[PDB]
């Protein structure tokens, strides 16, 4: 069923008033295609036939629902609190990103678009987008920085096995930044036949709301499951925060449960005092970035500060505007977790539960262990385990001296 709209922005994309968070800080050159997508999504999000299509792919193709697993062997490290893991690590492709690209690829098809484009850093969103496109028979082009493509030979290869074209951007710094730039330009030129698959709960309206809508399922499932296993609503629900899609997806169903604490954990890298971090809320301030007004890491002139994390997916200097609103409103707390705290939690989860998590997801596990100590014995904490750690085994093995030299 079409789910309620109490927490939705206004028609301009604003959360918290007609000039608050979100909006559309984009060129007029993008506005025709942004409006076409907006009108398309307004129609389809209330269409029972669209939701049935998405539900059907969620169930049979992607393997939803994901289970909720009480990681009893973490308890001793979380002040004897109870850590329940929402297992998005078991989705097809190995993360929550599949939820997003299924929704958008279906939408692209509803719009009569024959071609989908996207960009990727380390490769996760690129692989997810190429996956959904192969599924639905859409032509797929992924833009990726030259420095990333040479460093991610197997993810580029995955994308190509999936039938996608990978365009290595060799201009500028040859990074994510430059790929985004080429993707936005492709969109404008090819707007008549091309859909742009946004990677996270950020960007201009309608993307923060749409991406969150396709991730809502996580929290919906989790709210039923936790009451099933624990016999009550949790004391807290937590997640890692890059742009914010997995976090907002698990939080949404708990928003009107005023006894449930909501905590997002962001990448503090080497430490928030070192200037090598991605701690957008902890160290950033309000500004316009990549299409929305939210928090970002920016210098005294408003230039974007380069961010650092051991995880690719949290290494983002901004954050989705819905999170900015929820922060301003006092509803969600956002906290920093270092590379070291995350890797310690990665290792612990491997040894204690046999689950190799994404390093991104390990930031939430590390966070949850700290919140467990705060809340104490018997406290019930749901953690979004946003992905599996297969992609991270080499990084983790180097961290823990398992590859030698």
């Amino acid at each position: 069923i079409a789910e309620p709209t109490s927490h939705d922005p206004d028609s301009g994309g604003h959360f918290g008033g007609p000039s608050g968070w979100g909006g559309r800080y984009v060129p007029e050159a993008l506005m025709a295609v942004i409006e076409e997508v907006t009108a398309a999504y307004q129609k389809e999000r209330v269409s029972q036939d669209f939701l049935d299509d998405l539900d059907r792919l969620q169930a049979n193709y992607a393997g939803r629902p994901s289970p909720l697993y009480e990681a009893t062997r973490l308890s001793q490290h979380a002040g004897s609190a109870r850590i329940f893991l929402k297992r998005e690590d078991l989705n097809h492709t190995g993360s929550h990103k599949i939820n997003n690209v299924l929704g958008q690829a279906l939408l692209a098809r509803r719009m009569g678009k024959t071609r989908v484009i996207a960009e990727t850093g380390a490769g996760q969103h690129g692989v997810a987008t190429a996956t959904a496109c192969a599924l639905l028979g859409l032509d797929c082009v992924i833009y990726m920085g030259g420095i990333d493509t040479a460093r991610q030979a197997l993810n580029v290869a995955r994308m190509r096995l999936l039938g996608a074209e990978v365009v290595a951007v060799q201009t500028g710094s040859k990074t994510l930044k430059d790929a985004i730039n080429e993707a936005f330009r492709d969109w404008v030129a090819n707007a008549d036949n091309t859909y742009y698959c946004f990677g996270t709960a950020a960007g201009p309206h309608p993307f923060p709301t749409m991406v969150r809508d396709f991730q809502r399922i996580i929290g919906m499932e989790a709210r039923v499951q936790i009451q099933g296993q624990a016999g009550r609503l949790p004391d807290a629900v937590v997640a890692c925060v890059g742009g914010g899609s997995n976090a907002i997806g698990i939080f949404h169903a708990f928003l009107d449960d005023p006894g449930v604490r909501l905590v997002g954990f962001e990448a503090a890298g080497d430490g928030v005092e070192t200037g090598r971090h991605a701690a957008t809320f902890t160290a950033g301030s309000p500004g316009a970035f990549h299409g929305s007004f939210s928090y970002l890491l920016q210098d005294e002139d408003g230039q974007t500060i380069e961010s650092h994390s051991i995880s690719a997916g949290l290494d983002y200097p901004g954050v989705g505007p819905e999170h900015a609103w929820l922060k301003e409103a006092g509803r969600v707390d956002y906290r920093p977790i270092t590379d070291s705290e995350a890797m310690d939690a990665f290792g612990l989860l491997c040894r204690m539960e046999g689950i190799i998590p994404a390093i991104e997801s390990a930031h939430a596990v590390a966070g949850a262990l700290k919140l467990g100590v705060e809340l104490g014995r018997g406290a019930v904490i749901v953690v979004n385990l946003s992905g599996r750690g297969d992609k991270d085994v080499e990084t983790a093995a180097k961290w823990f001296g398992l590859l030698g030299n």
Binding site: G23, F289, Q298, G302
Partner: protein
């Protein structure tokens, strides 16, 4: 009440020509050299100078301007150096507007930046990622401090959005883009008498002349940056060629 840039266009149309509108980014190849370059544009016959604020994440920009802005930022260029470039251009008898992405203005303070741009002699602001829908603060700052406000329109702009963009602009409206450009200019003329400047990757006198048949101003940027990279003499020669192209009589 009259726009700040109105008399430049009134004067151009009285001499049967288009205004030459020249972009250069502050700090390319460094701050002093960029100021000497912008001064030379005024000396070589640019009616309006677009002073570019280099930004870390430009979305609209082609490789030429992107490589230049990245170099400018590597050199330590600051937003207040744009205010200094505006002062210099005004001192040389030029007419300057500032072209900037919106986040630097937000960081500065919108009212503050409009105040300090006006005080520097700036005549207006071009806002390539600010659409009217988000422009409430800017319109109040624009009215308070008597600055022109140049929004962009595009070939794909819907009738409803073309009308709102034109209605919210003051000075000129920037028509950013084979037959797409005159058709777009035609659509603006149908709803408003406002001057329309056309950007079209202009690189030559002949291209400036084609655009000058239907448009009130010919906007040039990438080709000026390419010229400057070669040297100041090359930039002077190109600007002279472009100034002859905008003249029909």
């Amino acid at each position: 009440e009259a726009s700040r840039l109105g008399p430049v266009f009134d004067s151009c149309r009285a001499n049967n020509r288009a205004a030459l509108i020249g972009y250069l980014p502050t700090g390319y190849p460094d701050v002093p050299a960029s100021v000497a370059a912008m001064t030379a544009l005024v000396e070589s016959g640019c009616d309006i100078i677009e002073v570019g604020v280099p930004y870390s994440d430009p979305v609209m920009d082609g490789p030429t301007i992107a490589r230049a802005t990245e170099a400018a930022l590597r050199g330590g260029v600051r937003v207040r150096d744009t205010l200094a470039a505006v002062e210099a251009i005004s001192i040389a008898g030029g007419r300057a507007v500032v072209m900037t992405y919106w986040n630097p203005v937000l960081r500065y303070g919108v009212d503050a930046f409009a105040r300090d741009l006006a005080a520097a002699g700036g005549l207006g602001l071009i806002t390539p990622d600010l659409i009217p829908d988000e422009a409430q603060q800017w319109l109040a700052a624009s009215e308070e401090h008597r600055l022109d406000r140049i929004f962009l329109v595009a070939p794909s702009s819907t009738p409803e959005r073309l009308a709102a963009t034109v209605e919210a602009s003051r000075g000129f409206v920037y028509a950013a883009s084979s037959q797409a450009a005159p058709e777009l200019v035609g659509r603006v003329k149908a709803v408003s008498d406002i001057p329309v400047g056309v950007g079209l990757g202009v690189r030559s006198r002949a291209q400036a002349a084609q655009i000058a048949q239907y448009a009130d101003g010919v906007i040039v940027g990438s080709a000026l940056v390419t010229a400057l990279t070669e040297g100041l003499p090359r930039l002077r020669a190109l600007t002279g060629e472009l100034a002859a192209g905008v003249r029909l009589g």
